[PDB]
Every structure is written in structure tokens, then in C-alpha cells.
Design a protein around this nucleic acid. Structure first.
Ligand SMILES: OC[C@H]1O[C@@](CO)(O[C@H]2O[C@H](CO)[C@@H](O)[C@H](O)[C@H]2O)[C@@H](O)[C@@H]1O
Ligand SMILES: OC[C@H]1O[C@@](CO)(O[C@H]2O[C@H](CO)[C@@H](O)[C@H](O)[C@H]2O)[C@@H](O)[C@@H]1O
Ligand SMILES: [Mg+2]
Length: 580
DNA sequence: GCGATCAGCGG
DNA sequence: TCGCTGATCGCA
């Protein structure tokens, strides 16, 4: 059954055809400055395996890799591109990426290796990566014979599957989505990850010391108030002190025991002084453990930079995710945690951080897709949307909107943006499910177009089996027909929400591609560093700020044309914290 | 070691 | 609402 192939000791001309399935294997999950364990090439002349030290040192092979006219079909080309970037080798001409193709066809499949993608087309002549490399502490690169056959079989699958995947994408009207959006974006993400973000470790270390001192004081205060020492970070141990020793009331319970979440504690504060201290301890501890220590653990000692990895093929909405470290959830709401951002600095002297974010892109997209007259007019007037929503839902003038009214209207808008259940709205507003649903009803009365869209999209999801975004991204919702209320209701909320969140994702992704092209045309040194859902973070010489103030918002605002304007706010400063 | 649990951060 | 990471704790 074995697959035939040449275990080459040297690179030959037939290995450099102008079209080929290419495998540049990087086994380590985090591919930054990681080893390339083997190479495989499948083209019209046959199948080949090349040892990396051999191929990567060969002038002809390197040139072939960097020749844009020599087309390669791969799986997760960003992984290979970045690993090659760390070795000073440019990878060009990738015309097809099976990972991105499979992702667009059905993000719910969770395709994470060639075998999984291949199974979509009943092709099983390739093993899953885990079966070959194992997992966890037992993970390891096998002997050359085993490794070589695996890489060749993966290349062979890619070679065979390109056609059927492109054919289905075309049928789904997603061919341009792959070739003009995701694949070009993949190269941009590769550049961003490789560039990395400079971190002021001394600053982070000082904050750590400060936090350590405050945690110590609060910790002792907690033991003092509890009358004994215990592991505060143990919900189980904490639950005993709180609901058994101190007798505080049990307002919420978890599947395994007493709930000790912040929202619960907030309500118990009045009963005992220990509660506020536990809340303070949770805050400080979160910062120390997750943001100070967690960040310091992944900073590269030699360059003092963190090189995140953007997972371009994970979410069912089309949004990107970030890991090692996750730079999409750095504190900002609370001033104490916000200061963490002072640690993210420009990578060069006299450079600054420039941040631009879309203002309410999700609600603007909703106004566009639902064609709601009231919502469109609100944005055409660039009104404060939360105040406007309050005015309509509570039937009052602008002057009559109180701070609490706006907060609740903002919470309602949030629930719409993220498609949360009428139950989740109650939890956030600390009100009853009945009252939460009551607000929703009032919202739809004020925004009849949105109500019509919500009803129509659910019916469409049921009829077609999926929902789509502005750029044709798709999400299958099989649960839309379930006779289980909660399961069905969630599917309905995803039907409503995906076109909103997903279209916003499409827009920012296109903006990134457009921005990179403009920066190059303008010969600016400025470059993208991070993307955080609705915002783009760049760094550039201080001499380029004025031009960026005009260029960045314009490019982002014109990425697509909607029935309402797109608005982009921007700031810049010495640190990410200052780009405020 | 590993996965389940619970917790909290952003958009 | 999700995707991420970290501390704890039962099972191995
Ligand atoms: O290279 C990223 C790419 O690889 C996948 C697997 O095909 O994820 C792997 O790498 C990520 C970044 O290190 C890890 O978070 C993940 O656990 C690991 O399996 C894809 O999901 C991703 O698009
Ligand atoms: O000091 C370590 C020792 O204290 C306990 C409580 O008896 O836990 C404390 O310290 C941990 C590490 O800093 C925290 O995670 C925990 O929240 C705090 O109460 C013991 O578990 C530990 O052996
Ligand atoms: Mg914003």
C-alpha cells in the first residue's frame, strides 16, 4: 500500500516545476524560530522528499521557493512562511492553501490537519498528524522512513484535493473569498507575527513587584477576616469559608458546588468585609498571573519581543484569534490593568504606536443588512448610538436620558452585537428574564427593520441550512431545526449574529489588505503589528504620524461601501497605552 | 502528566 | 457570545 517517492539526497530540476504541492513541515505548535523537520514536493514529474539542511542550503531550491511564478499548493502556508522567515528565506507563489479552503467551506469541521481536510472529500490515504507525531509529552518526530512517507502522503493529498476544493468554493461563490481575501491576508499575518511587538520587560517586572506587595497585604487581610488561612484561588476552599464558615447566602450554584464568580460576590459585599477583599484579590491576581507573569514567559530574551500566532482558521464568525501570547484581551476597562499596555512599545527609537478602531462597525453593518430606516438615519447623523437607543426604547428626549438609561441601552446593543440570549441580558443587567425580553420587544418596536431581518434570517438559515456574510463567508446551522428549545434558540441567535460579526470580520480583513498595499505605494515604513477584531495597531517613525492620521482611517473607512458610513477613530503615542 | 472545572479578560 | 490563559484538583 506504501506510496512511491524519491528520497532525494540532492535537489534536481524536475523538483522545481512551475506547479507543485509543497510541504515544509514544522512540528512544534508554535512555529516561531522553530525547526523544519522535512520537505516534500509533489508535481507532474513525481513525488520527492528532501532533508531540510539539504534543500534549504540549495541556491536553486531557495530561488524556486521565492519565485512568485512557481505556484505552490500547501496546507497552512503561514506556518511554513514564518518558519522560513526566521531562516531568512522568502516563500512566494502560494496559490492554494488547503487549510484556508477547508475553513471557508465549513469552519465548524475544525479542520486542523491535511487528513481532516481530506476526509471531507472521502480521501483517506493520509494519516492524521497526531497519529504520526503523538501528543503531549510523548510527541516526537519519527524516524526518516516514517516521516518521509507522511510528508509525501500529505503533499499527495494536497495535490489531489486542490481541484475538488476549488470547485466547491466556486459553487459556494467563495472562490474570490479564498484567493483575494484569506490567502493574501495570510501573508500579511505572517509579516505581523514575524515582526512581533517590542515589550518593555523592566516596566512589566516593576509592576509585578508592586502587585506582589499589594497581593500580600490583601491576602493577609483575607486570612484575618476569615479567621484562618486557605487557598483563595480555590473556588472549593473559598466556597467553604464563604458559604459555610461565614454563612453568606448562596445566590448561585455551579454544577460542582458554590459559585464564587465576581457577579455573585458583588451581591454579597454588604454581608461581610471579606468579600470586597476577595474581589480585590481576584483583580490583582488576574493581572499578576495572566498579564504580568504570563506575558514575561513568552517574551523573546534576545529581542524583547512577543510573536503571537494569529489562528486564521478557527472561529465560526471569520474573526481571527491570537495565542502565545493572546494579544486580543489585554486589560483596558480598569485603569490598574490598563497600565499593562504601557509595556507594549515601538520596536525602534523615535517610532510610535498608532491605533485605529472602527466605531460601532457591528451596529453599522446591522443597519446596512437590515436596511432599518431608524438605525441607518442614526448613523448617517453619527449619533451616540447608545443614547439614541435609550431615547427610543424609553420614549424620552435626549436631555431626558439618564446615565442608567444609557447603560442599559448600551447593554441591549451589546447583546445584539454578540447575539446573547435574553437570559444573558438579564445576568448583565441584573434583572429578570421577563424584563430583559421586555426591553428586546421595545427595541424591535423602535427598530422594525432589525426585527424583520432577525425573523427573515432565521427563516433563511432554516431553508438553506446556513447563513452568509457580506463577502460570502458561510456558517452551517444544523441545530436550527432541533426540537430542543435551548439548542434551537442558540442556533437562531447565531443565524442572526453571524452575518453581523462575520461581515465586520470581512471588512477589517479587506481593510488590512488594502492598507498594506497603500503603505507600500506610499513608501511608508509604518507596518501592522496587531489586529484586535475591530482595531488595527501599527508602529511607525514619528515622522509618519501626520500622514497616517489621514491614510489609515480613509483606507479602513473605504474598505467597502455600505448604506451607512463607516467611521474610524485613531490615536498614537509612545506606548500602546498612550495610543489613547 | 492530563483533562475537567471554574474564573475573568477583551471585542 | 466566544476564544484565550491560568490555578486548582481528581485520575493516572
Ligand atoms: O499554524 C497555525 C494553524 O495550525 C493549527 C493546526 O492546523 O493550530 C496549531 O497551531 C496553533 C498556533 O500555535 C495552536 O493554537 C493550535 O493548538 C495547534 O493545533 C490551526 O488551527 C491553525 O490555523
Ligand atoms: O503561600 C503558599 C501557600 O498558601 C496557600 C494558602 O494556604 O495559597 C496562597 O498562595 C498561592 C500562591 O501564591 C495562591 O494561589 C493562593 O490563592 C493563596 O491563598 C497554599 O495553597 C500554598 O501552599
Ligand atoms: Mg471600537
Amino acid at each position: 500500500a506504501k506510496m512511491a517517492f524519491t528520497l532525494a539526497d540532492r535537489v534536481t530540476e524536475e523538483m522545481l516545476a512551475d506547479k507543485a504541492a509543497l510541504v515544509v513541515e514544522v512540528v512544534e505548535e508554535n512555529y516561531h524560530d522553530a525547526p523544519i523537520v522535512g520537505i516534500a514536493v509533489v508535481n507532474e514529474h513525481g513525488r520527492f522528499f528532501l532533508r531540510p539542511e539539504t534543500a534549504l542550503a540549495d541556491p536553486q531550491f531557495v530561488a524556486w521557493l521565492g519565485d512568485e511564478t512557481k505556484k505552490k499548493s500547501m496546507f497552512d502556508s503561514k506556518r511554513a512562511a514564518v518558519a522560513l522567515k526566521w531562516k531568512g528565506i522568502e516563500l512566494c507563489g502560494v496559490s492554494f492553501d488547503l487549510l484556508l479552503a477547508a475553513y471557508l467551506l465549513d469552519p465548524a469541521q475544525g479542520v486542523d490537519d491535511v487528513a481532516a481536510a481530506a476526509k471531507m472529500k472521502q480521501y483517506e490515504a493520509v494519516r492524521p498528524d497526531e497519529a504520526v507525531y503523538g501528543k503531549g509529552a510523548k510527541r516526537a518526530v519519527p524516524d526518516e522512513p516514517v516521516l518521509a512517507e507522511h510528508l509525501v502522503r500529505k503533499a499527495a493529498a494536497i495535490w489531489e484535493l486542490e481541484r475538488p476544493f476549488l470547485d466547491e468554493l466556486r459553487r459556494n461563490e467563495q472562490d474570490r473569498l479564498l484567493v483575494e481575501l484569506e490567502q493574501p491576508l495570510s501573508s500579511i499575518l505572517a509579516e505581523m507575527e514575524f515582526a512581533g511587538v517590542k515589550v518593555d520587560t523592566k516596566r512589566l517586572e516593576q509592576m509585578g513587584k508592586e502587585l506582589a506587595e499589594q497581593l500580600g497585604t490583601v491576602e493577609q487581610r483575607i486570612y484575618e477576616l476569615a479567621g484562618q488561612e486557605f487557598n483563595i484561588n480555590s473556588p472549593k476552599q473559598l466556597g467553604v469559608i464563604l458559604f459555610e464558615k461565614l454563612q453568606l447566602p448562596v445566590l448561585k450554584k455551579t454544577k460542582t458546588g458554590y459559585s464564587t464568580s465576581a457577579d455573585v460576590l458583588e451581591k454579597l459585599a454588604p454581608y461581610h468585609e471579606i468579600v470586597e477583599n476577595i474581589l480585590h484579590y481576584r483583580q490583582l491576581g488576574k493581572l499578576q498571573s495572566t498579564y504580568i507573569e504570563g506575558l514575561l514567559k513568552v517574551v523573546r530574551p534576545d529581542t524583547k519581543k512577543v510573536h503571537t500566532i494569529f489562528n486564521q482558521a478557527l472561529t465560526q464568525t471569520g474573526r481571527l484569534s491570537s495565542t502565545e501570547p493572546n494579544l486580543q484581551n489585554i486589560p483596558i476597562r480598569l485603569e490598574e490593568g490598563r497600565k499593562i499596555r504601557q509595556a507594549f512599545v515601538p520596536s525602534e527609537s523615535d517610532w510610535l504606536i498608532f491605533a485605529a478602531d472602527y466605531s460601532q462597525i457591528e451596529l453599522r453593518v446591522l443597519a446596512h443588512i437590515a436596511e432599518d430606516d431608524n438605525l441607518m438615519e442614526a448613523f448617517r447623523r453619527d449619533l451616540d448610538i447608545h443614547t439614541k437607543t435609550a431615547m427610543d426604547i424609553f420614549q424620552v428626549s435626549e436631555d431626558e436620558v439618564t446615565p442608567n438609561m444609557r447603560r442599559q441601552a448600551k447593554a441591549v446593543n451589546f447583546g445584539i452585537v454578540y447575539g446573547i440570549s435574553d437570559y444573558g441580558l438579564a445576568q448583565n443587567l441584573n434583572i429578570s428574564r421577563k424584563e430583559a425580553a421586555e426591553f428586546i420587544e421595545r427595541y424591535f418596536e423602535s427598530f422594525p427593520g432589525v426585527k424583520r431581518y432577525m425573523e427573515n434570517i432565521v427563516q433563511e438559515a432554516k431553508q438553506k441550512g446556513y447563513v452568509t456574510t457580506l463577502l460570502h463567508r458561510r456558517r452551517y446551522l444544523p441545530d436550527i431545526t432541533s426540537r430542543n428549545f435551548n439548542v434551537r434558540s442558540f442556533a437562531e441567535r447565531m443565524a442572526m449574529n453571524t452575518p453581523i460579526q462575520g461581515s465586520a470580520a470581512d471588512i477589517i480583513k479587506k481593510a488590512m489588505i488594502d492598507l498594506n498595499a497603500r503603505l507600500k505605494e506610499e513608501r511608508l515604513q509604518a507596518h501592522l503589528l496587531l489586529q484586535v477584531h475591530d482595531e488595527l495597531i501599527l508602529e511607525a517613525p514619528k515622522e509618519e504620524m501626520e500622514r497616517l492620521c489621514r491614510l489609515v482611517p480613509e483606507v479602513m473607512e473605504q474598505a467597502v461601501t455600505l448604506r451607512v458610513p463607516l467611521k474610524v477613530d485613531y490615536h498614537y503615542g509612545s506606548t500602546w497605552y498612550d495610543a489613547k
